[PDB]
Design an enzyme around this catalytic site. Sequence first.
Site, PDB file in Angstrom:
ATOM      1  N   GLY A   1      54.755   4.218   9.447  1.00 59.98           N
ATOM      2  CA  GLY A   1      55.371   3.816  10.709  1.00 59.98           C
ATOM      3  C   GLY A   1      55.632   2.318  10.735  1.00 59.98           C
ATOM      4  N   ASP A   2      54.645   1.559  10.258  1.00 59.30           N
ATOM      5  CA  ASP A   2      54.735   0.109  10.095  1.00 59.30           C
ATOM      6  C   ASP A   2      55.845  -0.295   9.145  1.00 59.30           C
ATOM      7  OD1 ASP A   2      52.394  -0.025  11.692  1.00 59.30           O
ATOM      8  OD2 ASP A   2      51.117   0.111   9.916  1.00 59.30           O
TER       9      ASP A   2
END
Lengths: 306, 306
Positions: free
Chosen positions: B248-249
């Site tokens: 996600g990062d």
Amino acid sequence: MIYTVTFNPSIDYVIFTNDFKIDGLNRATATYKFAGGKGINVSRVLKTLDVESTALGFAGGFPGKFIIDTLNNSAIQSNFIEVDEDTRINVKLKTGQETEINAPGPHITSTQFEQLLQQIKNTTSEDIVIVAGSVPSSIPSDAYAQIAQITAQTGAKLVVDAEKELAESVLPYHPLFIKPNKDELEVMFNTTVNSDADVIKYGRLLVDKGAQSVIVSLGGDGAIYIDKEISIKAVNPQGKVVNTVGSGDSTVAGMVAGIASGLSIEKAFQQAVACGTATAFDEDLATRDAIEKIKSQVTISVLDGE
Amino acid sequence: MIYTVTFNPSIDYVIFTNDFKIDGLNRATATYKFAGGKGINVSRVLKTLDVESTALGFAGGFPGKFIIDTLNNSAIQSNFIEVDEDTRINVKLKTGQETEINAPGPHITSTQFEQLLQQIKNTTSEDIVIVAGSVPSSIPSDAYAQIAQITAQTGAKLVVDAEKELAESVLPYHPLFIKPNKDELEVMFNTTVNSDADVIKYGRLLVDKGAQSVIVSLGGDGAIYIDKEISIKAVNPQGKVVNTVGSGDSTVAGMVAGIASGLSIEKAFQQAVACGTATAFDEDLATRDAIEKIKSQVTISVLDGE
């Protein structure tokens, strides 16, 4: 000055969790970080007894920083050898089931081990060197005998707080004292040890083999100190044992503090036993008022000589 | 300049150990450590993509220093607010199972949080501020909004990757994009989202509430970018998911790096999905070559609009 040696200090990272799940996400609700090491423990007890010591050993990375700091915060001096890998962080999980997760020590080069030896080389006749605990894998296996060999050359007083085989290795170098137990004596000499006179006898043969003095730990049944010219029997008070971890470090430290601060052998031994007993009766390492409370209840008796 | 904000950064203490035994003494066969935290990971991926950023957020003690030195060794700048307690150490137990133990943050005072806001106050219209992570209990629970409100005045692009309510709270501040998952959409608008058309609909309603754009993560099914003027479908290559921690990062970092380095919305988005995929297919965060390999494989399609 009094030095302790902790070859493999740790951070004991104690973690309380909201229950525990394997293979899942867990949240810790509280954590604690304590500086671990048998040489550090001695230093802690010495300080408890109002006696200064400088902690030596190997520290690296941020965890090494933490331990140095913790000790500063306690007003215990340190001069650890800076190594290139992190000091180990051991994890103790305390929620529900109490689980331990121990890491291997950092790699320590030969240059680094030499830097420590260089400190022992800078000791004098009035210094006491206390080596405590296991020998990590990345230092020489005869680390105790090397340190001892150096103390023999400087005049520094060597005290060993380790299991028999490492204390045996330092014998020719005339330590100030070693601290075996009754059961280690039975193994060393291949005989049954079952009387205080038998304790005196085999402890004095170890004195013949090089030890300046021997403390034979007997458990809750006290301990015997042996010299070339005297032996002493100390009987500790009975009570609920809570945690014996540290009791050996304490005994060692009580003895040393007593010697360092001008107590007689007899009374230093009495302090020693009270220290080991105090720790035993406590969750952790003993408070001072616990030590003083117990050492009045510790009875000293001269077994032989003067 | 691009800024990542991590309120509760971590040392991720990774411990390899076989047959994890609860209530037992385990011995780790190996350990290692890295700087973790969402904003930190974004900085790490931006770096892999050759894009500068400065890590903001909270650091303290020697765990704090470790994060700064780790970032520095990686050629990533940081300007952390010194807090009075230790940066957390999160534990990852790698046996056959993967077991995370996440710790609380340090206590962070209001004055220290105020220091962070003062840094956001010094941003300009050309800056990007990425705020990612869970909010520690000791800082204002409306911390996202307090940041978002400053960027609205400074003119800096605000990027948010947070839990649904926190993402929802920055919307009136016109963040550049937010990044919910399909499941958060379902909770937000209390409805079932079962198609690409459904994702465009509820995603553009978020754009109506204030989001400049929205990326909706669909996991291994790709992602959808939603604008006022267009929606885009990304589809990533299939493969063995190794470890989605950080993906996600990495998606967020891919998108920011694209915009920052002059790419079209479409190609920036493609880069974004490649990053999150490449990470997923990796032990840790993706290498540059994994990312580039993967974006050749990511398909881009206009769903609606121009």
